[PDB]
Enzyme design. Structure first.
Site, mmCIF file in Angstrom:
data_model
loop_
_atom_site.group_PDB
_atom_site.id
_atom_site.type_symbol
_atom_site.label_atom_id
_atom_site.label_comp_id
_atom_site.label_asym_id
_atom_site.label_seq_id
_atom_site.Cartn_x
_atom_site.Cartn_y
_atom_site.Cartn_z
ATOM 1 N N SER A 146 0.790 -1.183 0.000
ATOM 2 C CA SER A 146 0.000 0.000 0.000
ATOM 3 C C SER A 146 0.832 1.246 0.000
ATOM 4 O O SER A 146 1.423 1.573 -1.031
ATOM 5 C CB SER A 146 -1.024 0.009 1.094
ATOM 6 O OG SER A 146 -0.380 0.078 2.347
ATOM 7 N N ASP A 338 -8.079 -6.806 -4.748
ATOM 8 C CA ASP A 338 -8.118 -5.583 -4.059
ATOM 9 C C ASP A 338 -8.514 -4.400 -4.988
ATOM 10 O O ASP A 338 -8.144 -4.312 -6.183
ATOM 11 C CB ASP A 338 -6.726 -5.391 -3.606
ATOM 12 C CG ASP A 338 -6.658 -4.172 -2.853
ATOM 13 O OD1 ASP A 338 -7.692 -3.648 -2.461
ATOM 14 O OD2 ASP A 338 -5.401 -3.824 -2.650
ATOM 15 N N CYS A 341 -5.620 -0.683 -4.057
ATOM 16 C CA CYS A 341 -4.390 -0.730 -4.895
ATOM 17 C C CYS A 341 -4.377 -1.772 -6.051
ATOM 18 O O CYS A 341 -3.352 -2.457 -6.241
ATOM 19 C CB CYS A 341 -3.121 -0.853 -4.087
ATOM 20 S SG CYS A 341 -3.001 0.341 -2.743
ATOM 21 N N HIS A 397 -6.074 -7.317 -0.827
ATOM 22 C CA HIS A 397 -5.145 -6.368 -0.200
ATOM 23 C C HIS A 397 -3.881 -6.882 0.476
ATOM 24 O O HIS A 397 -2.853 -6.245 0.393
ATOM 25 C CB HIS A 397 -5.751 -5.181 0.570
ATOM 26 C CG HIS A 397 -4.771 -4.032 0.799
ATOM 27 N ND1 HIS A 397 -4.507 -3.051 -0.213
ATOM 28 C CD2 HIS A 397 -4.076 -3.723 1.939
ATOM 29 C CE1 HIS A 397 -3.701 -2.154 0.337
ATOM 30 N NE2 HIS A 397 -3.372 -2.585 1.603
#
Length: 421
Positions: A146, A338, A341, A397
């Site tokens: 991230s 995800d 991102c 994620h």
């Protein structure tokens, strides 16, 4: 003053060390939790693991996506049948200052360029006190996800800054990261409107909304990139996270996995709440000999300051060209599940970043990649010299949490298979 998790549940047969590095002058108290490789600590490389936020504790990935143990209602540790240190000694730093377990009385870190600066001071400490990570000629890498996708390049430059250096970096891993906002940013709508694996989660109307809103948000990015000022960067952020992050959030689908839901407020992943639990408990807090009184996962303030400083929107993707240009093999991988991102987003930034092998990388061809371990296609390759972009199938994620087999598979074979996929 360092203790030993030794006393703690966590990973046994190993040899785990934890505690704090002190930075006198700045009065900065770094905190880390380490582990020897499960194999041979002497050959096996070393790894800096970085979580995002900004302003979130790294123990988070440790008990939750890629560490030895996890935490269940019983607030009792649990062996990972796929840990990252299966084949390498790992370090779990709590940056920045005031994050999770570290701290100070008065400081800053209201931005990236500077977080790096404290990092290099700690790595340089740490390498001193545990010079058993180097000499032997142990490959050092740093990794994260991230936001760490801002940190990471910048922290890297930094280290490669000193020739003074007390250690060597061999590569970096960035997963489900935010790096080149200007470019990743349009990948929002496509990814949420039935173009990136899972299907359209938003009515067409919301979808056009994103498209109108785009042009204005991207020039805001542009201004920020070229000026790097508070006056463009901050509004660029808000405006964009707005037009773009929000609608998805209205659906209340987890922002970290479009498959699974999480509705407004409560957890998008509850088990975490258990984690903030095992860390505050009296025994747990003790062994570690952590000099703090209350462990929180993310520190609101730091986040606020980052946001209030222009951060999120500055062109840290620029460092990646110098890196690439200074022969530093790099891995950008993304769980394709995800939203925050997207691998959609992360592919393309990579697909247009600049560096010497520019025309080449854009010439390479995508290739289905099999996992080392499980022997099944596991994601999707674009490889060129020491620059590689991996779309990880069935990744959300935190790739190492959804498909741990595969992660370590990606991991180790990169850590070990020669910086290629």
């Amino acid at each position: 003053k360092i203790k030993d998790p030794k006393i703690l549940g966590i990973d046994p047969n190993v040899t785990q060390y934890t505690g704090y590095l002190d930075v006198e002058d700045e009065d900065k108290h770094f905190f880390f939790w380490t582990f020897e490789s499960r194999n041979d600590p002497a050959k096996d490389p070393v790894i800096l693991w970085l979580n995002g936020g900004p302003g979130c504790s790294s123990l988070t990935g440790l008990f939750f996506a890629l560490g030895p143990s996890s935490i269940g209602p019983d607030l009792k540790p649990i062996g990972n049948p796929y840990s990252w240190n299966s084949n390498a000694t790992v370090i779990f730093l709590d940056q920045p200052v005031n994050v999770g377990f570290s701290y100070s009385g008065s400081s800053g870190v209201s931005n990236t360029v500077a977080a790096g600066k404290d990092v290099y001071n700690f790595l340089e400490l740490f390498f001193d006190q545990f010079p058993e990570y180097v000499n032997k000629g142990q490959d050092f890498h740093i990794a994260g996800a991230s936001y760490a996708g801002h940190y990471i390049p910048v922290f890297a430059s930094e280290i490669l800054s000193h020739k003074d250096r007390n250690f060597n970096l061999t590569s970096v891993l960035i997963g489900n990261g935010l790096t080149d906002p200007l470019t990743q940013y349009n990948y929002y709508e496509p990814m949420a409107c039935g173009e990136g694996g899972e299907p359209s989660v938003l009515p067409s109307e919301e979808c056009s909304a994103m498209e109108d809103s785009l042009e204005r948000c991207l020039g805001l990015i542009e201004s920020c990139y070229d000026s790097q000022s508070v006056w463009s960067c901050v509004p660029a952020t808000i405006y964009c996270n707005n037009a773009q992050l929000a609608p998805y959030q209205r659906t209340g689908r987890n922002v970290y996995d479009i498959r699974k839901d999480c509705e407004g407020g409560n957890l998008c992943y509850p088990t975490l709440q258990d984690i903030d639990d095992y860390l505050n408990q009296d025994y747990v807090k003790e062994a570690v000999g952590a000099e703090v009184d209350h462990y929180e996962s993310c520190n609101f303030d730091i986040n606020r300051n980052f946001l209030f400083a222009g951060d999120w929107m500055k062109p840290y993707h620029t460092a990646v060209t110098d890196l690439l240009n200074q022969d530093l093999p790099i891995l950008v991988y993304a769980g394709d599940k995800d939203f925050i991102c997207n691998w959609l987003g992360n592919k393309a930034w990579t697909d247009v970043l600049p560096w010497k092998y520019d025309e080449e990388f854009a010439s390479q061809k995508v290739r289905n990649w099999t996992a080392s371990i499980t022997d099944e296609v596991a994601g999707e390759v674009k490889s060129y010299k020491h620059f590689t972009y991996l779309r990880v199938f069935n990744g959300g994620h935190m790739v190492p949490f959804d498909v741990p087999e595969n992660a370590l598979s990606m991991v180790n074979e990169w850590i070990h298979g020669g910086f290629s996929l």
